[PDB]
Amino acid sequence: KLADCSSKSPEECEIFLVEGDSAGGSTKSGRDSRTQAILPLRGKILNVEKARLDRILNNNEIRQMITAFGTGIGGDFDLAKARYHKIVIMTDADVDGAHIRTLLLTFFYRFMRPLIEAGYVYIAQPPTGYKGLGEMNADQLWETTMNPEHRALLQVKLEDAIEADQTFEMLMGDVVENRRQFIEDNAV
Amino acid sequence: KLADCSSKSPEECEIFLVEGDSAGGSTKSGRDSRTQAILPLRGKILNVEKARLDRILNNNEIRQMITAFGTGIGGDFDLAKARYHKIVIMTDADVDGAHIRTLLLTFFYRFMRPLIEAGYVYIAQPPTGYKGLGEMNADQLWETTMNPEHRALLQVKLEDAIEADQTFEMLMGDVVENRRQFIEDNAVY
Amino acid sequence: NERNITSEMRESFLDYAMSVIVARALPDVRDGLKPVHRRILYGLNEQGMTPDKSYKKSARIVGDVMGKYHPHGDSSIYEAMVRMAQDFSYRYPLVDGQGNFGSMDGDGAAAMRYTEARMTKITLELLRDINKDTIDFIDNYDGNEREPSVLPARFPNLLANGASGIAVGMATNIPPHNLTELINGVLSLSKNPDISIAELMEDIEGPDFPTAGLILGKSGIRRAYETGRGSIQMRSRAVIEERGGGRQRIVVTEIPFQVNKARMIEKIAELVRDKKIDGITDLRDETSLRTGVRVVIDVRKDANASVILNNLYKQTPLQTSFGVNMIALVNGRPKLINLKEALVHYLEHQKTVVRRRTQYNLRKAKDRAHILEGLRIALDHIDEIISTIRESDTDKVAMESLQQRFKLSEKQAQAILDMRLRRLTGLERDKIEAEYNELLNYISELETILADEEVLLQLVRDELTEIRDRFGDDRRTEIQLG
Amino acid sequence: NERNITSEMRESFLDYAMSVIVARALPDVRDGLKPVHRRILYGLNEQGMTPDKSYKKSARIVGDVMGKYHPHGDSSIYEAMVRMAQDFSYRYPLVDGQGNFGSMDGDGAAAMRYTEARMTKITLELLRDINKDTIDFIDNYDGNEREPSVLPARFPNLLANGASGIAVGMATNIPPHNLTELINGVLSLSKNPDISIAELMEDIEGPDFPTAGLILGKSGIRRAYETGRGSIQMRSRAVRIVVTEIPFQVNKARMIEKIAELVRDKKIDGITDLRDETSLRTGVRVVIDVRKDANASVILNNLYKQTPLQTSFGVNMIALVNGRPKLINLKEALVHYLEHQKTVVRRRTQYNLRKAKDRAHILEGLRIALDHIDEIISTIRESDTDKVAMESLQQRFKLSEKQAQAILDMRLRRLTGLERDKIEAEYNELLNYISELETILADEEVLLQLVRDELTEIRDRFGDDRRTEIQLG
DNA sequence: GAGCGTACGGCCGTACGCT
DNA sequence: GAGCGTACGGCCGTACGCT
């Protein structure tokens, strides 16, 4: 499913994780195929803070990502083997896009933490005037979201390890009450 | 997928071949579950006049029918083993319903010919005012199509074996031109 | 640019969670509807798919909603519409379906191009007075349409048809109830704001499932009505019959709510096969449209059917729990509500709907009376009116001259310029006076309602009583004591 | 009751076959549209989704078309609309899409709730004069709506955008053509009914694919235009060898994978590596690194033979003529189209004349009413009912029932000074308009010239350059 | 022989909360 | 604990003609 870039120099290579073949086709058309790779994902991935390892390792989307990044998993992980120095989480500015963002960040936090620590994980969404990536023409997708000349990527930073561990357990973990209380306390 | 009847006396037992789970559910609700069985089919079946035996035998919908009828196929066919004395082809009065009718009759003609000869194969469609079986409520499906007291079933009859063999080869066979000429010649009707 | 992983996680999880809560999974306390259901019913209203007009294909309604209101998969709309038409799912069905709308054995509905739908007579009551400024309209997803934020809901639908929804941080599970009991409860609450739950329970005995069956005791019911949470035990209606030759058989005629009959029978079959239950010789589904639900369990000679039946309640879905968790949107926020809170919010909603309808009707009537006053002046001095218009070069001059000469408003003068020559006839002249006099009386009646809060409150009671007498039916579920 | 297996088979197969033929798979010769495509375009017209208004979501269009005209799967409607918006599929795109509408590598369009659409400027021309009694309207599937049987189609769409369809007993495969060449062909035919195909080919050189590329010779083209059938060889534009244009309906990704397959299995040799250097900026670019001292001319000729780098277009020009499928040559296609245009213009003129004559009659009565308004008012005021008022107005002023009705329906605002002058000015202008319309209908040559003038305007406005090179040999 | 495009059938998977 | 119902992802099969 991965539409790889021609370059094999990871420092200059970037991968855009897009939600569906609905954003896959347009980004594959709009990209600079020299240094930009596209990994279209089949909707919501497994919540790795709830799921057990055997279920996680047998998931074809989880497998696709591990294979594409070339770092490996925990015991065999290697940051020097990373095939891209930019892993861009591309989602829509909506309910489902927001959830996909949280599930993906959960996977990277629990299974590929040094990737965040190295500043390789980025976040991108449509610019104001659009709600979804599927609304955009490939040229606008390039000029506003993919063109390194003028784009809007947010680098994901790990500032406090204790606070992050607590946040991921509260929001994505098995205890509903902690999440319910967070919603109740921060509702606007 | 077959929703069988309680009775095991084939003489009084009837099976309705319906298009999809879309007609399956309502006929399963509307039937007399004592003597009426329902076999919902997953759309258009294989054209057995074009397809080879290996492809036909590996088809699940073809397999389900063979299993349900009991009889067997071709040389191993046994009319005395037939679980139902009425096999009703239930289709809609539309483009897709018409094609399903032709594909099913083709299967019955090439693989279960004595079933037609015994007068076990019947044809049913929605009554006037309805185009599709999915438009009908189960009570109307019962009262107009499934109730032996007042229904409209057409018994399929084999009159001329040579003329039928020619009809099935012309309409369902590999030679497009014979079919094109038939369409061209009978387009007025 | 950079972003803290913690800040992003909290922000994105909150955006997702709130959206599922307020705009997807949970119903509003006032009308008892989730966004998708409200849209289907509004869609049916605007497309004029009323009970008195012919059925239209489901694809016309689905496509319209897809469409103008719900930019999600057409299956989500169709599936929700199907359930609303199921008499085994909805205690008071909201959709009047023609064709295959699914079965109790989990068989799906036919494709939307074959099925046909329209509103039920009771759905007219959900939408009643929607175009009389009773409820607030909001822009649709693209700003091209206007959609209701809530429906007038002239019957307490939340409790009547119940609800279930899995959200984020919470879930809802409201059982359906009897409409007669509910309206009686609302009427008792309308007379005494300080009414207790125990007093309300004299009207609202407990849940009332479309699938009938039984409820074991009032302890679970009471707990659920007092707190908003409680387990209610649902039992199938089963009797022990004689087969002949000293043999016995269990006959099941009613099963619990949301229980798949085919899956329940397959569970009984699995247990007899695995030898986990003994004394069962045969098991058959003798269900028909004419005879209703009938599941026959043949019992082995000399074996106790009472013991076998008690084991079936324990080991199979023949006895199922309804875990009550009454969560609904109150002032656009999720809230765990008890029986009294549910009825209070509903009654408050009804008072607002009728007050706003009366206020709208009064504005509408006062505006029309003003127009008729101008037309009456025009008809009394028509030769003068015509001269004024004829002398004028433009419509602006004609209007200014009519306002100045006959002391008319801009609106009155406009109505005279828009008056057809046909209206000068004898019958048309009398029609205007007759309309005016009738309107004067209507305005007085409306003003009487708005001057006294008790007269308005009684109007709510009278309108609810009419619904109760029209749509109120018999209780189906027996509450055994217990 | 009983039925003969033969009678049933023949009856059911015929019902199915004719329905796929006339109401699904094949296009009408006049507008070049299959039922689903006509419905999408009509739907866009009724929903006012014109080029001058803002985009609307595809779900809003699909849902309308599905419920009002096409009771089949919403994906069938969406898929057909997506193709209409693809500049690599349609020579003259009919849908103006915003968002992901698919790619040349067979990537699908985004969900219909994400994409937006509206009509293209050229689609306005397919629908032009539809509400001027130019075409016949028929009842929709449920009798609640009215839908066109054919569109006015003020440009020869069948040949312009081409067609393909698998039916029963037959199939169609018409390639797309250049609009300038086509209108020039129609104009040449309009001046000489006895024109030969060879003469027409001086205007219409051959097919013109949106994907450009080349055509090997005119032999295949000629055979297809003469008989309605013929193989046309499409070749990629290739000059290490660099591919800049690929044949029509060829999947670039699959073509590259086919070349990659040939190199792995040692089928072809003398090639180091192959890369898809296509970008939105550079356009189609497929580069193949040729091995040192190996003949690139020989390698390229083998690629044409062994891969879809050279693909055939099997022409089979089948279209619905008088609601029947027919194999048509180039002249027949243009004759049916020109005949359709003549009918559209004649019917528009006849409609405009009825409309004008009716209005002139109304203005005559209003002129009498305004000249004697004091008497008119007295007559109405004296009358108890509208029936009495009407009978009394017809009797005194010799007015018709229609004229008297228009006076009773007249608003008091129509009594102002400027409003009486407006009625006289409209009447005098209308008298001249009627004369102009009658001149068009009295002379078949004046009508035929109007068709020519209207077609020339389309040609000058939408006509573009040829993309496909027709290589000599 | 395997795609194309109109039509129609099926089958799985993910989150989310509470049994 | 597979299922409930709102949301979203995927995969596969059938006919039909031509090449």
Coordinates of N, CA and C in Angstrom, one line a residue, chain C residues 334-424:
Chain C
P334 N -24.1 16.3 28.7 CA -24.6 14.9 29.1 C -24.9 14.9 30.6
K335 N -26.0 14.3 31.0 CA -26.4 14.3 32.4 C -27.0 13.0 32.8
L336 N -26.7 12.4 34.0 CA -27.4 11.2 34.5 C -28.6 11.7 35.1
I337 N -29.8 11.3 34.6 CA -31.1 11.9 35.1 C -32.0 10.8 35.7
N338 N -32.7 11.1 36.7 CA -33.7 10.1 37.3 C -35.0 10.3 36.6
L339 N -36.1 9.5 37.0 CA -37.4 9.6 36.3 C -38.0 11.0 36.4
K340 N -38.0 11.7 37.6 CA -38.5 13.0 37.8 C -37.8 14.1 36.9
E341 N -36.5 14.1 36.9 CA -35.7 15.0 36.1 C -36.1 14.9 34.6
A342 N -36.2 13.7 34.1 CA -36.6 13.4 32.7 C -37.9 14.1 32.4
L343 N -38.9 13.9 33.3 CA -40.3 14.5 33.1 C -40.3 16.0 33.2
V344 N -39.5 16.5 34.1 CA -39.4 18.0 34.4 C -38.9 18.7 33.2
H345 N -37.8 18.3 32.6 CA -37.2 18.8 31.4 C -38.1 18.7 30.2
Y346 N -38.9 17.6 30.1 CA -39.9 17.4 29.1 C -41.0 18.4 29.2
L347 N -41.6 18.5 30.4 CA -42.7 19.4 30.7 C -42.3 20.9 30.4
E348 N -41.1 21.3 30.9 CA -40.6 22.6 30.7 C -40.5 22.9 29.2
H349 N -40.0 21.9 28.4 CA -39.9 22.0 26.9 C -41.3 22.2 26.2
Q350 N -42.3 21.5 26.8 CA -43.7 21.6 26.3 C -44.3 23.0 26.6
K351 N -44.0 23.6 27.7 CA -44.5 24.9 28.2 C -43.9 26.0 27.2
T352 N -42.6 25.8 26.9 CA -41.9 26.7 26.0 C -42.5 26.7 24.5
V353 N -42.7 25.5 24.0 CA -43.2 25.2 22.7 C -44.6 25.9 22.5
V354 N -45.5 25.6 23.5 CA -46.8 26.2 23.4 C -46.8 27.7 23.6
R355 N -46.0 28.3 24.5 CA -45.8 29.7 24.7 C -45.4 30.4 23.5
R356 N -44.3 29.8 22.8 CA -43.7 30.3 21.6 C -44.7 30.2 20.4
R357 N -45.5 29.2 20.4 CA -46.5 29.0 19.3 C -47.6 30.1 19.4
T358 N -48.0 30.4 20.6 CA -49.1 31.4 20.9 C -48.5 32.8 20.6
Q359 N -47.3 33.0 20.9 CA -46.6 34.3 20.7 C -46.4 34.5 19.2
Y360 N -46.1 33.4 18.4 CA -45.9 33.5 17.0 C -47.3 33.8 16.3
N361 N -48.3 33.0 16.7 CA -49.7 33.1 16.2 C -50.2 34.5 16.4
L362 N -49.9 35.1 17.6 CA -50.3 36.5 17.9 C -49.6 37.5 17.0
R363 N -48.3 37.4 16.7 CA -47.5 38.3 15.8 C -48.1 38.2 14.4
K364 N -48.3 36.9 13.9 CA -48.9 36.6 12.6 C -50.3 37.2 12.5
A365 N -51.2 37.1 13.5 CA -52.5 37.6 13.5 C -52.5 39.1 13.5
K366 N -51.7 39.8 14.4 CA -51.6 41.2 14.6 C -51.2 41.8 13.3
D367 N -50.2 41.2 12.6 CA -49.6 41.6 11.3 C -50.7 41.6 10.2
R368 N -51.5 40.5 10.1 CA -52.6 40.3 9.2 C -53.7 41.3 9.4
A369 N -54.1 41.6 10.7 CA -55.1 42.5 11.1 C -54.8 43.9 10.6
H370 N -53.5 44.3 10.7 CA -52.9 45.6 10.2 C -53.1 45.7 8.7
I371 N -52.8 44.6 7.9 CA -53.0 44.6 6.5 C -54.4 44.8 6.1
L372 N -55.3 44.0 6.7 CA -56.8 44.1 6.5 C -57.3 45.5 6.8
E373 N -56.8 46.2 7.8 CA -57.2 47.5 8.2 C -56.9 48.5 7.0
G374 N -55.7 48.3 6.4 CA -55.3 49.1 5.2 C -56.2 48.8 4.0
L375 N -56.5 47.5 3.8 CA -57.4 47.1 2.7 C -58.8 47.6 2.8
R376 N -59.3 47.7 4.1 CA -60.6 48.2 4.5 C -60.7 49.7 4.2
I377 N -59.6 50.4 4.4 CA -59.5 51.9 4.2 C -59.5 52.0 2.6
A378 N -58.7 51.2 1.9 CA -58.6 51.2 0.5 C -60.0 51.0 -0.2
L379 N -60.7 50.0 0.3 CA -62.0 49.6 -0.3 C -63.1 50.6 0.0
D380 N -63.0 51.4 1.1 CA -63.9 52.4 1.5 C -63.7 53.7 0.7
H381 N -62.5 53.9 0.2 CA -62.1 55.1 -0.6 C -61.4 54.6 -1.9
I382 N -61.9 53.6 -2.5 CA -61.2 53.0 -3.7 C -61.1 54.0 -4.9
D383 N -62.1 54.8 -5.2 CA -62.0 55.8 -6.3 C -60.9 56.8 -6.0
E384 N -60.6 57.1 -4.8 CA -59.5 58.0 -4.3 C -58.2 57.3 -4.5
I385 N -58.1 56.0 -4.1 CA -57.0 55.1 -4.1 C -56.4 55.0 -5.5
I386 N -57.3 54.7 -6.5 CA -57.0 54.6 -7.9 C -56.4 55.9 -8.5
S387 N -57.1 57.0 -8.2 CA -56.7 58.3 -8.7 C -55.2 58.6 -8.2
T388 N -54.9 58.3 -6.9 CA -53.6 58.5 -6.3 C -52.5 57.7 -7.1
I389 N -52.8 56.4 -7.4 CA -51.9 55.5 -8.1 C -51.7 56.0 -9.6
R390 N -52.8 56.3 -10.3 CA -52.8 56.8 -11.7 C -52.0 58.1 -11.9
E391 N -52.1 59.0 -10.9 CA -51.4 60.3 -10.9 C -49.9 60.1 -10.7
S392 N -49.5 59.0 -10.0 CA -48.1 58.7 -9.7 C -47.3 58.1 -10.9
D393 N -46.1 58.5 -11.0 CA -45.2 58.0 -12.1 C -44.5 56.7 -11.8
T394 N -44.0 56.5 -10.5 CA -43.4 55.3 -10.1 C -44.1 54.7 -8.9
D395 N -43.8 53.4 -8.5 CA -44.4 52.7 -7.4 C -44.1 53.4 -6.0
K396 N -42.8 53.9 -5.9 CA -42.2 54.6 -4.8 C -43.1 55.9 -4.5
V397 N -43.4 56.7 -5.6 CA -44.3 57.9 -5.5 C -45.7 57.5 -5.1
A398 N -46.3 56.4 -5.7 CA -47.6 55.9 -5.4 C -47.7 55.5 -3.9
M399 N -46.7 54.8 -3.4 CA -46.6 54.4 -2.0 C -46.5 55.6 -1.0
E400 N -45.6 56.5 -1.2 CA -45.4 57.7 -0.4 C -46.7 58.6 -0.4
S401 N -47.4 58.7 -1.5 CA -48.6 59.5 -1.7 C -49.8 58.8 -0.9
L402 N -49.8 57.4 -1.0 CA -50.9 56.7 -0.3 C -50.7 56.7 1.2
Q403 N -49.5 56.7 1.7 CA -49.1 56.8 3.2 C -49.5 58.2 3.7
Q404 N -49.2 59.2 2.9 CA -49.4 60.6 3.3 C -50.8 61.0 3.3
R405 N -51.6 60.6 2.3 CA -53.0 60.9 2.1 C -53.9 60.2 3.0
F406 N -53.7 58.8 3.2 CA -54.7 58.0 3.9 C -54.1 57.5 5.3
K407 N -53.0 58.1 5.7 CA -52.3 57.8 7.0 C -52.0 56.3 7.2
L408 N -51.6 55.6 6.1 CA -51.3 54.2 6.0 C -49.8 54.0 6.3
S409 N -49.5 52.8 6.7 CA -48.1 52.4 7.0 C -47.5 52.0 5.6
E410 N -46.1 51.8 5.6 CA -45.4 51.3 4.4 C -46.0 49.9 4.0
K411 N -46.2 49.0 5.0 CA -46.7 47.7 4.8 C -48.2 47.7 4.3
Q412 N -49.0 48.6 4.8 CA -50.4 48.7 4.4 C -50.5 49.2 2.9
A413 N -49.7 50.3 2.6 CA -49.7 50.9 1.2 C -49.2 49.9 0.2
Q414 N -48.2 49.0 0.6 CA -47.6 47.9 -0.2 C -48.7 46.9 -0.6
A415 N -49.5 46.5 0.4 CA -50.6 45.5 0.2 C -51.7 46.0 -0.7
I416 N -51.9 47.4 -0.7 CA -52.9 48.0 -1.6 C -52.4 48.0 -3.1
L417 N -51.1 48.4 -3.3 CA -50.4 48.3 -4.6 C -50.4 46.9 -5.1
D418 N -50.3 45.9 -4.3 CA -50.3 44.5 -4.6 C -51.7 43.9 -4.8
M419 N -52.7 44.6 -4.5 CA -54.1 44.2 -4.6 C -54.5 44.0 -6.0
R420 N -55.1 42.8 -6.3 CA -55.6 42.5 -7.7 C -57.0 43.1 -7.9
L421 N -57.3 43.5 -9.1 CA -58.6 44.1 -9.5 C -59.8 43.2 -9.1
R422 N -59.6 41.9 -9.1 CA -60.5 40.8 -8.7 C -61.1 41.0 -7.3
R423 N -60.3 41.6 -6.4 CA -60.6 41.8 -5.0 C -61.6 42.9 -4.8
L424 N -62.0 43.7 -5.8 CA -63.0 44.8 -5.8 C -64.4 44.2 -5.9

